[PDB]
Every structure is written in structure tokens, then in C-alpha cells.
Write a protein that binds this ligand. Structure first.
Ligand SMILES: Nc1nc2c(ncn2[C@@H]2O[C@H](COP(=O)(O)OP(=O)(O)O)[C@@H](O)[C@H]2O)c(=O)[nH]1
Ligand SMILES: COc1ccc2c(c1)NC(=O)CN2c1nc(Cl)nc2ccc(F)cc12
Ligand SMILES: [Mg+2]
Lengths: 68, 427
């Protein structure tokens, strides 16, 4: 019985050293992925409105051509 | 009847090494393994502790074990370091970091089989193997955690040989780290189950004896270990030398241990001496006898007047009258007969050996199975729960697999042990 216990304790220290490398590795990848989407989503929002600005400069120039 | 010696970790190897120096000098064996002595009394029982090598050299039957290469290299560099059979240096490299769990479950597990292999080679050489004696401390990690793991495994391979330890108790007065009470409670649980005989070498008592009685203002481990080698030579006298007794570990265990778990002995020594300085008046047999029973000479910080002596062995070394020994020993009993149990008749036994230890002309070594040793196990139980009630420092151990439960069991077994010693103090 005592040796059964002795190997269960070393199996736990391994189990937990491992679960800890695991959850770190995963916590990282989750963060790095949510960060690319967020930063991109933000850069996309900036462009979508910088370009909606270009569409309004078409509409404005096409109005002065409805002057002549 | 061969004995197999094992010393494990920082403390077990440092005192382990002094023991072999000390007794190598008493048996006239030198640092090369060559005998250069006067009396035949020195070689008649040399085989109990030494193996006889070709060229008629003597090699200690000693297995040296550490999770760290540090101390063990210092042994090999020490004065008698060359005497030790080099194959018997078994050691890892990671260390055990004063952590019982690393000694017992992770780091020690890796290394234990290689130790068990050198133990096996030595046992097989043996003609009639009495058993084993281990030197370790209970307060670090190697000697404490791995040490008891070895003791568990030896008892599985050799279930019917005697297991004897010299266990150094930790003390805030001489402490490396704050987890020593944790490490020692875990070990004491092991020791109650798996040894026949353990000598409780308290570092508290070694410290006070160094400070109060030897007047050493700032005692080193070398000062403590001088006391430890004196006691160790003492208690092993009647195993290494010829006398009327001619004892062995088993007879020792039969007569000293009335109840299997109460096998924790208080050693004591007289005269207390400090290294180097030799005083020149020999003692008188009455002096040895009063001093050796003196609490100031006990190597376990317990007051013998707070318990009862279950059994007692006393060993006298030097040229002296066995009449006066008989008389002086019969007199301390019948003067303080209250402190010996009535229900083990004639529980004090005495032996004499002609050869005194080096430096002294006459000496008395005391081995007491007193119920006052509970005071030691209470002291440590208090320091244990002082932290454990807040689960302090526990992570060092839960990190290596251990459960809180394992601590509750060890704590609980020790409080049981103290209750058991308390039962017989009233009987
Ligand atoms: N009497 C004595 N005690 C020691 C000595 N070395 C260490 N200790 C005690 O042992 C405890 C430390 O355990 P230690 O054996 O050094 O750790 P280990 O190397 O992992 O076994 C401390 O509480 C010290 O008081 C020594 O040389 N003499
Ligand atoms: C209390 O009753 C006994 C106590 C001890 C013993 C004993 C009976 N009888 C035995 O045969 C072994 N023996 C001893 N063993 C060892 Cl190793 N050292 C000793 C040193 C001094 C001494 F007085 C006895 C022993
Ligand atoms: Mg240390």
C-alpha cells in the first residue's frame, strides 16, 4: 500500500506540473488570438470610415457636375 | 554478526564521518585501513563494523548517500575519507532543498534503487547480518525524507533484520529553515513504524550543553558533532568490543523496548568535554554515575524527572572497580526509585569495557527509554501546528504531490505517540 501511495504522489506532481504548462500555453494562445482580432477589428473600423469619406468626396464632386 | 551503516544527507554524512573517525581510532585502524594497535580487544569484533579487505585492510561497511554532491565530496576530502569503499558513494545532483517531499517522493525516488543496490552487495557479503544503523537528521530533506524512504524499503527487503537509527532532532536554536518541524513530524511518523531503535540526538540539547556546560559562546556544528561522536562511540561500545555482555542490536531491542512504538531512547554522556581542551583529573565512579543520570548530560532536551524510566542501559569505559560500579549504580536507583517503573523489575542493566575512548581515562554512556522523551515530541508538535493551522509553507510540499491529509495523519500519529508515552508515566 505504501508504494502504491508513493507512486500516486509522484504521478500527481507530474499531473500538476503538466496541467500548469497546459493552461499557461492555452491562456497565452487565447490571449494572442483575441488580440489579433481586436487590433484588426479596430484598424478595420478606422479604414471603413476613412473610405466612407472617399465615397462622400465622390458624391460631393458629382454634385458640382450637376451644376453644369 | 555484521552491521550495515548508512549515512544520508548533510547531517548524516557529517556525523556519520565523525563516527568512523572516532571508532577507527579506537580499533587502531588508520586512514589507510591498516591496523596499528596494541590490544587484541581492538580486532576481536572488528567485523561487526568493518569488512576485511585483501592485504588485511579494513573497510567500513558504510553506504554514503546524498541527493547532493556537496558534503559527500567533503567526506572524501576529510581525514578518513579514503577509508570508505568508493563504490559505496551513491549520490544524485539536484539536491533535496530541505524538503521532506523531495527526499521521500520525487528526487529521492529517482536515487533510492541505486542505494538499495549497494546495500544488497554489502548484505550478501555478510555472514550473519544483524541489521542496519542509519545516521540522518529529521529536519532537512535528504536524510529526513529519503532516509525514511530507504528505511521503508530496507524493511521490505529485510523484514526481519534490526533497524537502528541515530536521528538528529531539529531546534530553533540550531535551525537551517522554518520547515524543520514539518520535516521532522513526517519523519517521526516513519520512525515509529519502521525502526526497532532510534537514538534521539536533539540539537536543542547539544546546543545547551555546548553553551551552558562547555561555556562555548557560539557553538558550531563541529562542536555539536563532537558531542554526537562521543555518544555514538558510547552506545555502540557493547557491540564493537569484547566483554561480559557482547551485545547485538536484537538483544538490545528485546530488553529496551517493552512496547513496539516506544523505542525512542535518550542518550547521555559523562564527562561532557569540549574539543581540544583535555582536562587531566579522571572522574570517580560516583561522578560518572551522578553526571550520566544528570539531565545536563542528556542529549535529548527532556527532564528525566518529568517521566519514568521504562528501561535503562549504562556503559562504563576504563579501568575501574566493577564493585564500585555495581554499588554506585544500585545506589542511584534506590535513591530515586520513584523514577523507575515498578512494573518492569530490575530495568537498569550495566556493562563495562576496559578500553576508554580517546582523550579520557574513564567514561559513562547512558541509554534511557524514558517516558520523558514525550517532551521532545510535544515540542515539535507545537512548532508543527503553529504553522500548519495556517497552512503556512505547505505549498513547498503540495507542489511535489503531497496532500494536506498526509500532514494531518503525521501530526495525528505523533500526538498519539505522546499520549502513549503519557499512559505509562502514570501506570
Ligand atoms: N548536530 C548536527 N546537526 C546538523 C548538522 N548538520 C545539519 N544539522 C541539522 O539538520 C537540519 C538540516 O538537515 P540537513 O541534514 O542539513 O538536510 P539534508 O542534507 O537534506 O539531509 C538542521 O535543522 C540542522 O540543525 C551537524 O553537522 N550536526
Ligand atoms: C535494560 O536491560 C538491558 C538493556 C540493554 C541490554 C540488555 C538488557 N541485554 C543485552 O544483551 C543487550 N543490552 C545492551 N546492548 C547494547 Cl548494543 N549495549 C548495551 C550497553 C550497556 C548495557 F548495560 C546493555 C547493552
Ligand atoms: Mg542544511
Amino acid at each position: 500500500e505504501k508504494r502504491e501511495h508513493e507512486r500516486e504522489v509522484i504521478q500527481k506532481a507530474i499531473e500538476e506540473n503538466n496541467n500548469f504548462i497546459k493552461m499557461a500555453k492555452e491562456k497565452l494562445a487565447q490571449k494572442m488570438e483575441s488580440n489579433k482580432e481586436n487590433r484588426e477589428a479596430h484598424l478595420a473600423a478606422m479604414l471603413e470610415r476613412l473610405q466612407e469619406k472617399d465615397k462622400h468626396a465622390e458624391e460631393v464632386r458629382k454634385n458640382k457636375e450637376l451644376k453644369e | 554478526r555484521e552491521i550495515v551503516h548508512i549515512q544520508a544527507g548533510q547531517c548524516g554524512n557529517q556525523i556519520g564521518a565523525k563516527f568512523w573517525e572516532v571508532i577507527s581510532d579506537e580499533h587502531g585502524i588508520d586512514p589507510t585501513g591498516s591496523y596499528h594497535g596494541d590490544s587484541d580487544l581492538q580486532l576481536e569484533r572488528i567485523n561487526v563494523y568493518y569488512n576485511e579487505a585483501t592485504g588485511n585492510k579494513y573497510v567500513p561497511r558504510a553506504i554514503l548517500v546524498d541527493l547532493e554532491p556537496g558534503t559527500m565530496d567533503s567526506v572524501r576530502s576529510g581525514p578518513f575519507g579514503q577509508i570508505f569503499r568508493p563504490d559505496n558513494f551513491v549520490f544524485g545532483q539536484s539536491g533535496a532543498g530541505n524538503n521532506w517531499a523531495k527526499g521521500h517522493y520525487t528526487e529521492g525516488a529517482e536515487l533510492v534503487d541505486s542505494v538499495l543496490d549497494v546495500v544488497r552487495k554489502e548484505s550478501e557479503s555478510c555472514d550473519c547480518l544483524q541489521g542496519f544503523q542509519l545516521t540522518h537528521s529529521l529536519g532537512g530533506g535528504t536524510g529526513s525524507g529519503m532516509g525514511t524512504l530507504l528505511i521503508s524499503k530496507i524493511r521490505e527487503e529485510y523484514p526481519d533484520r534490526i533497524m537502528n537509527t541515530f536521528s538528529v532532532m531539529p531546534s530553533p536554536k540550531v535551525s537551517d529553515t522554518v520547515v524543520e518541524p514539518y520535516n521532522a513530524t513526517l519523519s517521526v511518523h516513519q520512525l515509529v513504524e519502521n525502526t526497532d531503535e532510534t537514538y534521539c540526538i536533539d540539537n536543542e540539547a547539544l546546543y545547551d550543553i555546548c553553551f551552558r556546560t562547555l561555556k562555548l559562546t557560539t557553538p558550531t556544528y563541529g562542536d555539536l558533532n563532537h558531542l554526537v561522536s562521543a555518544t555514538m562511540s558510547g552506545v555502540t561500545t557493547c557491540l564493537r568490543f569484547p566483554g561480559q555482555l557482547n551485545a547485538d542490536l536484537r538483544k538490545l531491542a528485546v530488553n529496551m523496548v517493552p512496547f513496539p512504538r516506544l523505542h525512542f531512547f535518550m542518550p547521555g554522556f559523562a564527562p561532557l568535554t569540549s574539543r581540544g581542551s583535555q582536562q587531566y583529573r579522571a572522574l570517580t565512579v560516583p561522578e560518572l554515575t551522578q553526571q550520566m543520570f544528570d539531565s545536563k548530560n542528556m542529549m535529548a532536551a527532556c527532564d528525566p524527572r518529568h517521566g519514568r524510566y521504562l528501561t535503562v542501559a549504562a556503559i562504563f569505559r576504563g579501568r575501574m572497580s566493577m564493585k564500585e560500579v555495581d554499588e554506585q549504580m544500585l545506589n542511584v536507583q534506590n535513591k530515586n526509585s520513584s523514577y523507575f517503573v515498578e512494573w518492569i523489575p530490575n530495568n537498569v542493566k550495566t556493562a563495562v569495557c576496559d578500553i576508554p575512548p580517546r582523550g579520557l581515562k574513564m567514561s559513562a554512556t547512558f541509554i534511557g527509554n524514558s517516558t520523558a522523551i514525550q517532551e521532545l515530541f510535544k515540542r515539535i508538535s507545537e512548532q508543527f501546528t503553529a504553522m500548519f493551522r495556517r497552512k503556512a509553507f505547505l505549498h513547498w510540499y503540495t507542489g511535489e504531490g503531497m496532500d494536506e491529509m498526509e500532514f494531518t495523519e503525521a501530526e495525528s500519529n505523533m500526538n498519539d505517540l505522546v499520549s502513549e508515552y503519557q499512559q505509562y508515566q502514570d501506570a
